[PDB]
Structure formats: structure tokens, C-alpha cells
């Protein structure tokens, strides 16, 4: 048909359960490549011994369920979809 990329949006997210980790083989681990950029050191607290900073953070991973072929989708490469509509890693900071 011809609604274009909207089709894609359906096709991927139709039965997609965002609770299960996106791997066809459960034994296969999902690798998250991360990136940290220091924007500013906001404040150091010498008394309470606590540092407050601002970071630009980048997360890259592989969603094995959200894969498709560019063809028969009008040669679409990438698609912008809501963050909270897909599985997301729970990476945090210990400090």
C-alpha cells in the first residue's frame, strides 16, 4: 500500500512487547555502547563530599525485534519512535 513509513511504524510496534529484552536467542546478551560528555561542573560540596555535574549521555544498543528490510518500505533507513514505547536498559550510576 501507500501510507508510507506509517506502515513501518505499525509493522514493528504491532505486537512488540516492551517488557521482554529484544533478543531472538535469550542466551545472547544485549550490548549497550555508552558515551559521556562533560558539559559543566555545577557544584562541588567539600563538606558533604558530593559532586554535582551535568552530562550529555548517549546510549546505543541492538533491538533484535525492531529489524526490517529497507525495501518494500520505500527504502526507509531509520525511524523515530517514542522512547517509552520500546525496551530500555536500566544502566545507572553507583555514586
Amino acid at each position: 500500500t501507500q501510507p508510507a513509513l506509517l506502515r513501518l511504524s505499525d509493522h514493528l510496534l504491532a505486537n512488540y512487547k516492551k517488557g521482554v529484552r529484544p533478543v531472538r536467542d535469550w542466551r545472547k546478551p544485549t550490548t549497550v555502547s555508552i558515551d559521556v560528555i562533560m558539559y559543566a561542573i555545577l557544584n562541588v560540596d567539600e563538606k558533604n563530599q558530593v559532586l554535582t555535574t551535568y552530562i550529555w549521555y548517549r546510549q546505543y544498543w541492538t533491538d533484535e525485534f525492531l529489524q526490517w528490510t529497507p525495501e518494500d518500505f520505500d527504502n526507509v533507513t531509520k525511524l523515530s519512535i517514542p522512547t517509552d514505547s520500546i525496551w530500555v536498559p536500566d544502566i545507572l550510576i553507583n555514586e
Epitope: 555502547s33 546505543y60 541492538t62 533507513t77 531509520k78
Partner: nanobody, 124 residues
């Protein structure tokens, strides 16, 4: 894995002009640097032109070899996903196979990618 496709190569008389196009494609990639290479029969690989964004994150910065210093002009179109090489006053010594080398970063990591290259023959 980003794929590169060269095009525009052909036969031209000396002193003529020819425009080469290199089209990149893939899934998730970031072209950090794009170089043009040429290889004459028997001769080594020669660096022709390159392009990379400046320290200021707006205007680009080109890099030319002493050989093609004045004749060649490398440009790009992010919208058309294609990097161009404008060859003016082609010499018979400029005759070679022109590849394009893209230093790109993917989910796998930072790596170099090469195209199939196009034949550029300058003869009378």
C-alpha cells in the same frame, strides 16, 4: 557496514572536466572523514582529496594533495547522501581508477570503508 558506490567516471579529452560522485548508504553510521583515492595501473594508491567538519561544528574543511591542488574540488551533499569530486583541466596523468574511502563509525566501531571505484581515462 556502510556501502560506498562511485559513479560519474568516463572518457574525457585533456583539459576537460568531469564530476565524480560517491554515494554512502547503510543503517546506523557516522562518516567522520571521506577521502578520495586514485590508483593508476601499476602505480600505488594516491590520496586526492578529503573533507571533514572543522573545529567549529558548522563549516567543513577540505584537504587536497599538491598534485590536484588547483584543479580538483571536493564537496558534499548530506541531503543527497553523496560526496562529490569536481575535476577540472584533466591531465593524461590523472587517468586512473578512483575509489572513495569513508572513515565511519557504526555500532560495531570506527572503521574504514571502500567503494568499487570508477574508471577515469583521459586520452586524445
Amino acid at each position: 557496514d556502510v556501502q560506498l558506490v562511485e559513479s560519474g567516471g568516463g572518457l574525457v579529452q585533456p583539459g576537460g572536466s568531469l564530476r565524480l560522485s560517491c554515494a554512502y548508504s547503510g543503517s546506523l553510521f557516522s562518516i567522520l572523514r571521506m577521502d578520495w583515492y586514485r590508483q593508476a595501473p601499476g602505480k600505488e594508491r594516491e590520496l586526492v582529496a578529503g573533507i571533514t567538519r572543522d573545529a567549529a561544528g558548522y563549516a567543513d574543511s577540505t584537504n587536497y594533495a599538491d598534485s590536484v591542488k588547483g584543479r580538483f574540488t571536493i564537496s558534499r551533499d548530506s541531503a543527497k547522501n553523496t560526496v562529490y569530486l569536481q575535476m577540472n583541466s584533466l591531465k593524461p596523468e590523472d587517468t586512473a581508477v578512483y575509489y572513495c574511502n569513508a572513515d565511519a563509525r557504526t555500532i560495531t566501531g570506527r572503521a574504514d570503508y571502500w567503494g568499487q571505484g570508477t574508471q577515469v581515462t583521459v586520452s586524445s
